[model samples]
Target: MKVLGVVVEYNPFHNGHLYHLTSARELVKPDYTIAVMSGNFCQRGEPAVIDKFARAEIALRMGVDVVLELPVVFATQDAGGFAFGAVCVLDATGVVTDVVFGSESNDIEFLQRVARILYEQPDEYQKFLHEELKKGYSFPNARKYALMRYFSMKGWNEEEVLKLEKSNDILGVEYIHSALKIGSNIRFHTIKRVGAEEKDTSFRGRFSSATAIRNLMREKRWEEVRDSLPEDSFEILMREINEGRGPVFLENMGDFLLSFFRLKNMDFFEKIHGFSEGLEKRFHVCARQTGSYRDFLECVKAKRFTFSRIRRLALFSVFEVNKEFVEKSNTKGPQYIRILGFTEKGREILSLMRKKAKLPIVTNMSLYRKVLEKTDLPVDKQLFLEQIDLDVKATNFYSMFFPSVEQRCGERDFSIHPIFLRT
Candidate 1:
């Protein structure tokens, strides 16, 4: 059986995402397709426009067979961790034959070569990274320049290294690297991206990005929003908005974050993940000094830190995602496969997964402990509980930020069942 695997956020499931999904199916022609998607928060350190359940349902309606969630710890991380968690979940399925992603450079071999170097970090490249870091470059920029130097030393076109600057290609490298880390045999393919790049917030008519679409949603520009999404996608999005439970922007929880930080001192931040290089000090001072979340981020922003990283750190603070928890997560990997939605035909594929999967499968929230108790796999039970609890807490916290006070209540994870669509 040929099964295709995909990783997505689908924050609002725009036209660009549909094109990528269709292109991936066309390239592989697989019998079944599974996706590991982001939940409430995205890799960009922002909340979804609606929610994960709504997003997963749309994916099922489109073409995907089974939609599983990429755990919150990994979903809110940088490209490397995000790709690692997503790839691990797909590989653990033990049935995925191919994994496909959309990328600006569609050059699989080129990305593989880069990924190989990254996976097997050579001494020369390691030295370059240290030198660049010591020279005051941020890790991302430092790695970019170091790779350029390494490629030049090897007598290759150094310009090729610049592809890392693109978000999709950078993630493409991490996907391959993560596959290598776990000894996954799934073949990788990249479809050349067609619309505007992810960073391009400018509207592109029918091909507008999730970012642009959300911007329109924020403006209540339903006409342009309708133009950007499929009929069903638009309907579901409107459903959430009209219900006053949706269209949650980053700024929606901004004041809550700022207030939360006021109670935390520098010492408290020191324990959080990514709180290094005197970042704790910066966060402490900025939280007290700045009047708004936007200003606080601007205060913390420097040439060394990307805004996304800063934003993610802010979430880490709110969630109390500490260094030890994240370290354990990175080392041990995800503990359970949480299903979000599936079709009736998809049930057979899921049945196959029950016997083949390496990690525990979490299909029922109430029976999660039972699922873990029965697992023969060497699962880290404490880590499993901690990881899943974070997912639950994150959902509760995110729901509280809903636009409607009446809609916001606890138990979102428990109340909502996995979306099962019957065709």
Candidate 2:
């Protein structure tokens, strides 16, 4: 059975994502669709509004056969690393032969062409990019100027320029580039998004950006954006919102973010991958002096680490992420799937599919303990799971179908009470 792959944050899995998955299924006609998703933290430098297992469970319910993790290391990166991480996890599945993505411009050939140009990173283009990047725009924007502004005659057009401006297309190209970089043999597919439009950070009727939805959630306008998601996604959103835990309702650990800034000494910033030499001091100044996460972005967000990068730093700060962990995650693909819960069909599917999998299917908690014992994981991953454990009560995952997250502790019997049960 040929498998189809999707890389996503699912960030509540809006209607646009559902549309993309549905359309991709029609095009690929695969036996099953597998998704590579963000962990408790997402790429945008925000905590996942909900838990990863909850999102995975919902995806499985909505016709996806399996849900694997993208790993925190890659989930909270810029476009290139984010793209690489998602595609690599899917490719590691061994069953996935095609990757389907939601695109601003659903022109696969155009995306392919852009991918080729970026992969080559021609001399003139690279030079122009660094010169523009010296001004501090995100890598995506820098590349646009390099291609459209500098080398306009060689296939650059208004449409290409517009495409370059979009976050999705930048990521789409990264997916293609990641595929080639790893020498993974996976076909590519794109599905047009059906929303109000990109950059429309508002809920108009049933259309909105993920950022907008998150903004709404932050504003406590939960009921308003409820309808923007598919049935499964809506269910997950409702559960998380009511339970009042995870990224959706957890208080921002401001001090943690400040620590990320404090760590950025003159030399420290240079060590961060994209943080060019001069940018570090400015980033440190803004973060240390400024009050909010956005303020830090205002300071450090330049040609390389744009809003996305700043957001990334904020998220990284919340989790205290740094450079050392990134190097360890440079492994080829996912190593295992630690099962959260499975229905009868889910179990049957696992039994039939386990051995064929390239990576081991991790179902037993005891085995997870063993792996944690044998191989030392990154501090972020270690802390991530602990946070989940702290957030999750010791209760059964499925006993309360609606409020699954509240029972995160794995307790056999514990009635749902307050929003937080402080120990």
lDDT tens digits, residue span 108-198, model 2: 8888777887787788777888898898675556777777754375645734667766778888988998888888789998888778665
Worst 10 residues of 1 by lDDT: 195-204
Which residue pairs collide in model 1, if any? none
- lDDT of predicted model 1: 0.91
What TM-score number comes out for model 2? 0.77
| Candidate with best TM-score | 1
Residue 318's lDDT within candidate 1 is: 93
Off by over 4 Å in 2: 121-138, 149-161, 246-251, 259-274, 299-305, 317-320, 331-353, 369-423
Clashes of each: 0, 17
Q: Write the per-residue lDDT of candidate 1 for residues 1-423, one digit (tens) a residue.
A: 799999999988988899999989998999999999999999888898889999999999998999999999999999989999999999988889999998888899999989998999999999999999999877888888988898999998889988878999999999999999988998999999888777777786978877888888888889999999998999888888889888899987889999999999878999899888899999999999999999988999987777899999998889999999999999879999999999998998999999999889898898998988988999999999999999999999989878799888768898899999998
